[PDB]
Design a protein around this ligand. Structure first.
Ligand SMILES: OC[C@H]1O[C@@H](O[C@H]2[C@H](O)[C@@H](O)[C@H](O[C@H]3[C@H](O)[C@@H](O)[C@H](O)O[C@@H]3CO)O[C@@H]2CO)[C@H](O)[C@@H](O)[C@@H]1O
Ligand SMILES: OC[C@H]1O[C@@H](O[C@H]2[C@H](O)[C@@H](O)[C@H](O[C@H]3[C@H](O)[C@@H](O)[C@H](O)O[C@@H]3CO)O[C@@H]2CO)[C@H](O)[C@@H](O)[C@@H]1O
Ligand code: NI
Length: 210
């Protein structure tokens, strides 16, 4: 899963992530989706691998505008990478973090400088962390609501309870942003869209995925 050489310093992991091309970040994402397709499909029910790639590109867009060195938050919300993978994804990160032992299909990397700041491990962990919440959402939700509430869980820690302004501004936005890539032939190039871009079709933003 690791992208850069093990032993690479924190400073260089960050600088080498800020200089990754959009196309290279897409390629990292697709390789994790390819590696973990079966658990992604079992949890989320996505139609196919292409639409699952697009969903994750939606996430990278909403979370980092595809800037792989983006770093935000503090403690449990402290996040890095294209998908803004929070510390709570990682094993042994802090004892006050709620456990994520419900994705046995994907290795839970320990919290270490390399595993947090390496773009490859960050992306793998972001997908595992999202499937931790999406599998919780599956207990009560079906269809597009597994991913919509999965996202609420990814961003907030809770699948339920957010204000409905945010399920639209954050989870529906993610679905609409990912579909732009699929509809406009941006699945492998350096082109990206962004939160609120008025070009993006926000109508029925989940239907493409199922
Ligand atoms: O709160 C959800 C996630 O937000 C991430 O920040 C994103 C902003 O929410 C989003 O508004 C901003 O979109 C900008 C874009 O960055 C800029 O290039 C474009 O010109 O304008 C857009 C609209 O203002 O994108 C950022 C991500 O780059 C946080 O990074 C993430 O931690 C948080 O979970
Ligand atoms: O009361 C239950 C336990 O809560 C623990 O805090 C959690 C917060 O309630 C939850 O909001 C936060 O969620 C993170 C999320 O994991 C992350 O992906 C996202 O980027 O940021 C969210 C926060 O904005 O997770 C924390 C930790 O699991 C308390 O630490 C714990 O004592 C308490 O029993
Ligand atoms: Ni992986």
């Amino acid at each position: 899963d690791g992208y850069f050489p093990p032993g690479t310093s924190k400073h260089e992991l960050i600088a080498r992530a800020s200089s990754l091309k959009v196309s290279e970040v897409k390629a990292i994402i697709k390789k994790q989706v390819d590696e973990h397709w079966d658990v992604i499909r079992d949890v989320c029910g996505f139609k196919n691998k292409e639409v699952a790639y697009a969903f994750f590109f939606g996430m990278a867009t909403r979370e980092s505008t595809f800037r792989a060195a983006t770093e935000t938050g503090s403690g449990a919300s402290h996040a890095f990478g294209p998908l803004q993978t929070a510390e709570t994804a990682y094993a042994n990160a802090n004892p006050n973090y709620m456990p994520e032992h419900n994705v046995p299909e994907m290795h839970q990397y320990d919290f270490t400088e390399y595993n947090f700041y390496d773009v490859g491990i960050s992306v793998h962990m972001g997908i595992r962390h999202f499937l931790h919440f999406a599998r919780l959402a599956k207990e009560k939700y079906s269809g597009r609501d597994i991913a919509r509430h999965g996202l609420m869980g990814y961003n907030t820690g809770w699948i339920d309870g957010a204000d409905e302004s945010w399920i639209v501004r954050y989870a529906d936005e993610t679905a609409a942003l990912g579909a732009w890539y699929l509809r406009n032939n941006h699945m492998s190039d350096d082109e990206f869209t962004w939160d609120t871009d008025p070009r993006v079709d926000r109508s029925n933003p989940w239907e493409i995925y199922y």
